[PDB]
Structures are given as structure tokens and as C-alpha cells.
Amino acid sequence: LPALIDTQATAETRALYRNLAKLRYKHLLFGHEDSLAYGVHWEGDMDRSDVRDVTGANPAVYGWELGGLELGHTANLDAVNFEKMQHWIKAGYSRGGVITISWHVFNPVSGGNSWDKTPAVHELIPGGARHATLKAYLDTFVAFNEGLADVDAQGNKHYPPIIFRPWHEHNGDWFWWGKGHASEQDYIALWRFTVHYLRDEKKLRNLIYAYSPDRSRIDMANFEAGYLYGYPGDAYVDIIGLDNYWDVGHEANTASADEQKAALTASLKQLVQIARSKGKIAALTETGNNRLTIDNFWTERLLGPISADADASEIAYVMVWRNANLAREKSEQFFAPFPGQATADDFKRFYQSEVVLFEDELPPLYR
Ligand SMILES: OC[C@H]1CNC[C@@H](O)[C@@H]1O[C@@H]1O[C@H](CO)[C@@H](O)[C@H](O)[C@@H]1O
Ligand code: NA
Numbered sequence: 370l371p372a373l374i375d376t377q378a379t380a381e382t383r384a385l386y387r388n389l390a391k392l393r394y395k396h397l398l399f400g401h402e403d404s405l406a407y408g409v410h411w412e413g414d415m416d417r418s419d420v421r422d423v424t425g426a427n428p429a430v431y432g433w434e435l436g437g438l439e440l441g442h443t444a445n446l447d448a449v450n451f452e453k454m455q456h457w458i459k460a461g462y463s464r465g466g467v468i469t470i471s472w473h474v475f476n477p478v479s480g481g482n483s484w485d486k487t488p489a490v491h492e493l494i495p496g497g498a499r500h501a502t503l504k505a506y507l508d509t510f511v512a513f514n515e516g517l518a519d520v521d522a523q524g525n526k527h528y529p530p531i532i533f534r535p536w537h538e539h540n541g542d543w544f545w546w547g548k549g550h551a552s553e554q555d556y557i558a559l560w561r562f563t564v565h566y567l568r569d570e571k572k573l574r575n576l577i578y579a580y581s582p583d584r585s586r587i588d589m590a591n592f593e594a595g596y597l598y599g600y601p602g603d604a605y606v607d608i609i610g611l612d613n614y615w616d617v618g619h620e621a622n623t624a625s626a627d628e629q630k631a632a633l634t635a636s637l638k639q640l641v642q643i644a645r646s647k648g649k650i651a652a653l654t655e656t657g658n659n660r661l662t663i664d665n666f667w668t669e670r671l672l673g674p675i676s677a678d679a680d681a682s683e684i685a686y687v688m689v690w691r692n693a694n695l696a697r698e699k700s701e702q703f704f705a706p707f708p709g710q711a712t713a714d715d716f717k718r719f720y721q722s723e724v725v726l727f728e729d730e731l732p733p734l735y736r
């Protein structure tokens with residue numbers, strides 16, 4: 370019953386959205402960022418994942434990241450080669466997995482990265498001096514997407530559906546498109562242009578658009594108002610997402626574990642209520658406990674609070690962030706386990722739950 374904002378979406382893209390809308394009541398898809406690219410202790414293998422090394426299964430949802438594509442780089446900001454990324458997207462999709470993409474766009478004004486707060490949104494939007502730059506940046510995604518296509522025996526082109534999740538965590542102040550660096554109206558203009566350009570001008574038909582504020586900057590006494598800061602309108606969003614690392618044990622959060630569990634459930638309950646009111650689908654688009662320091666994290670801090678409330682449980686998927694490779698990145702950072710990591714057995718339990726689906730037990734999402 371939810372309908373995509375692209376009324377002409379490909380059959381496979383329509384099917385994915387419809388099937389997520391059906392599956393969400395009884396199930397939760399598990400996702401991992403950069404899951405096939407590397408893990409904490411390995412890089413180079415062309416078909417491997419830390420998640421699979423622990424559980425025997427790939428994640429159901431594969432997250433990927435485009436930052437640097439817009440500058441013509443051959444690899445993204447975490448050194449993931451774009452040609453390999455296209456291969457991995459196609460491989461995951463061929464197995465029935467779901468694809469989602471974020472984009473830590475570099476700062477066009479300074480040439481710095483997404484964390485360089487030099488103002489740029491006002492320049493990029495329609496009427497802005499750098500509007501040609503926004504078009505050029507988006508054109509690089511159009512080209513990347515073409516490298517995901519196949520053409521069948523009848524001459525018809527097919528693509529993997531993509532849950533495209535741009536301009537994320539915009540209620541935070543850490544990215545240049547965030548609060549304090551861009552006005553609310555200019556952010557909305559940026560989002561609306563992104564959709565008009567990709568869906569209407571460029572006629573991409575394989576996208577599902579996900580909106581994803583950060584929970585850590587939402588007042589829980591006024592959740593809906595905070596969630597809807599910068600919301601561009603129902604004609605511009607398909608997935609009512611949320612990045613919530615706060616209620617799952619973030620080091621800076623002084624709330625007790627019991628308060629945090631309750632807040633996780635409440636955040637997802639309200640997310641789902643917003644999605645229901647709008648005819649959309651909700652998802653926990655980013656979460657996790659960096660370095661997996663919390664005993665029984667998966668069952669006690671993630672699955673338990675989601676399953677505690679029937680509204681909260683109607684999220685369609687949950688994705689955790691990447692497993693950075695220690696040999697080349699000096700800051701230890703990971704959100705899924707690897708063999709021998711302390712939470713590995715609890716992650717097996719999470720996988721084993723009847724609620725949680727990894728790639729190996731997905732129904733056919735694309736018909
Ligand atoms: O803390 C984990 C996430 C939370 N969401 C914002 C994101 O920037 C952050 O992780 C960083 O992600 C970038 C892009 O992949 C990466 O370069 C950094 O090293 C962090 O993983
Ligand atoms: Na669900």
C-alpha cells in the first residue's frame with residue numbers, strides 16, 4: 370500500500386518497496402556497510418565478509434558509500450575502488466540482497482571533505498553560483514549507476530534497485546549540509562533539486578529515496594518536530610529513516626542502559642508512527658556499538674528493544690556501519706563482529722532469531 374515517489378519505477382524497484390512493506394511486520398532485514406570490501410583483519414578477497422565469516426550468511430542489506438565519486442576519484446574516501454564496488458553491488462543483488470548508498474560529498478567551495486564546514490549549500494541550490502557543480506556531481510552518480518546495468522536478450526536494460534540516502538544526519542552540525550552551515554529552507558531546496566534532477570531530468574527509475582536525521586540531535590520530548598527539521602515533503606521521500614547510535618551505548622551518553630533501551634524503543638515507535646501517517650516505510654538506517662564493547666549487544670541492546678513494541682518492530686531493516694581495516698586505518702572502528710570478537714556468539718543468536726533476516730533467508734524481493 371505505500372507507493373514510491375517515482376510513479377514509473379522499474380518493476381524490480383516497485384517490487385522491492387512492496388515486499389519491504391509486507392515483510393516489515395514480522396521481520397527485520399540486517400544490513401552492513403562496506404561488507405564485501407574489507408573487514409577488520411582482511412582486504413583483497415573478492416567474495417568475503419566479516420558478517421559471513423561469523424554467521425555463514427551475508428547481510429540482507431549492503432550499504433555502500435560514494436564520497437569522492439563527484440571528484441572523479443577512482444576510489445571512495447575510504448579507498449574502496451569504484452569498479453570493485455560496482456562488481457560487489459551486482460554480486461549482492463544477484464543473490465537477492467538489497468542495495469543502499471550514502472554519499473559523504475566533498476566540500477566544493479574548499480575542496481575539503483564532508484566535515485569541512487565551509488558553507489556550500491546556498492551556492493549549490495537552484496539560483497546559486499555553484500548550481501552547475503551540483504549538476505556535475507549528480508551526473509557522476511548517473512554514470513556510476515549505468516555501470517550497474519545489464520541488457521537482456523530482448524534488448525531491455527535492467528538495474529539493481531538502490532535505496533539512495535543522500536544528505537544524511539542533516540540535523541547535526543558535523544557535515545557542511547548540516548544545521549548551522551545551511552539554512553533549513555536551503556537544505557530543503559537541495560533535497561528537492563536532488564530528486565527533481567535524478568528522477569525527472571535524468572530519468573533514473575531504480576531509486577528509492579531515504580531520509581535520515583540523527584537521533585542524537587532530536588529532543589525526545591518533541592520527537593516529530595525534531596525529526597521533521599529539514600523534511601522536504603512527502604513527494605520527495607520513500608523511506609523514513611533514522612541514524613541512532615545514541616541509544617545503543619554511545620560513549621558520550623550518560624543515560625543508564627535501561628533508559629537507553631527505552632529511548633531506542635520510543636525513537637523507533639515514533640519513527641514508525643510518522644511513516645504510517647505518511648504512507649511510507651520506516652528503517653533504522655544506521656546504528657551500532659563501535660568496537661562492540663557491550664556484552665550481548667545484539668540481543669539485549671538492539672533486537673530486544675526493537676521487539677518490545679509492535680510499532681517499533683515495524684521498521685523494515687537495520688544497518689550497522691563499516692568494519693574498518695586495521696592494517697591501513699589506524700583508528701580501530703567496527704560495528705559487526707569478526708571471528709573471535711567478544712560479541713560473535715551473540716551476533717549468531719541475532720542472526721538465528723526468526724525475526725531477523727540475512728541474505729540466506731530472504732524471500733524473492735524483486736518480483
Ligand atoms: O560513526 C559512524 C558513522 C556515523 N554516521 C556518519 C559517518 O560519517 C560515521 O562514520 C564515518 O563514515 C565515513 C564514511 O564511510 C568514514 O570515512 C569514517 O571513517 C567513519 O566510518
Ligand atoms: Na520489522
Ligand code: NA
Binds near residue numbers: 719720722723726
Ligand atoms: Na534469522
